[PDB]
Amino acid sequence: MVLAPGASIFRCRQCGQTISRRDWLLPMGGDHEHVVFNPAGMIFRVWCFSLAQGLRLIGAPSGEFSWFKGYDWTIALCGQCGSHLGWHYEGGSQPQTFFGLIKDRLAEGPA
């Protein structure tokens, strides 16, 4: 529907690893963008994706402090460089699983 789009793929900002695509953004509670803080007070602009790749999911899930009701999280690192890119979420409903990735740790560009 658009020739030569420059904004279709998300890659790891620190190394280039393919991570997700704009077509895979997922509006959780009506918005694909959720702004949250961890217990250390860090603010994150979290983009929700249905699907992602090139990550490494660390350990087992935890429900503690989850920003998304009904889901447990696993830390998602870039599988190539180890940069912490976000979290994989599971154990919930409609959808069962998704990714919440930290927007400013990704780079957007052409396929």
Ligand X SMILES: O=c1ccn([C@H]2C[C@H](O)[C@@H](CO)O2)c(=O)[nH]1
For the record, the structure tokens of 13 come out as 């900002």
Q: ∠65-58-72 over CA atoms, to 5°?
A: 30
Residue 107 Cβ vs ligand X, minimum distance, rounded to whole Å = 21
Residue 96 contact, options Zn ion, ligand X, none, Cβ 5-8 Å cut-off depending on partner type: none
Q: Which of residues 80-99 bind ligand X (CB under 6 A)?
A: 87
User: Which residues neighbour 105 within 8 Å (Cβ) at sequence distance 6 or greater?
Assistant: 12, 13, 14, 83, 84, 85, 86
* 33 lines the binding site for ligand X (CB under 6 A): no
* 75 lines the binding site for ligand X (CB under 6 A): yes
Judged by CB under 6 A, the number of residues near ligand X is: 8
SS3 89: strand
The b-or-e profile of 48-60 (16+ CB within 10 A means b, else e) is bbbebebbebeee
Which stretch, 16-24, 25-33, 47-55, 62-70, contacts ligand X (CB under 6 A)? 62-70
Query: From the annotation, which residues make up the binding site for Zn(2+)?
Result: 12, 15, 78, 81
**Site for ligand X, rule CB under 6 A:** 38-39, 65-67, 73, 75, 87
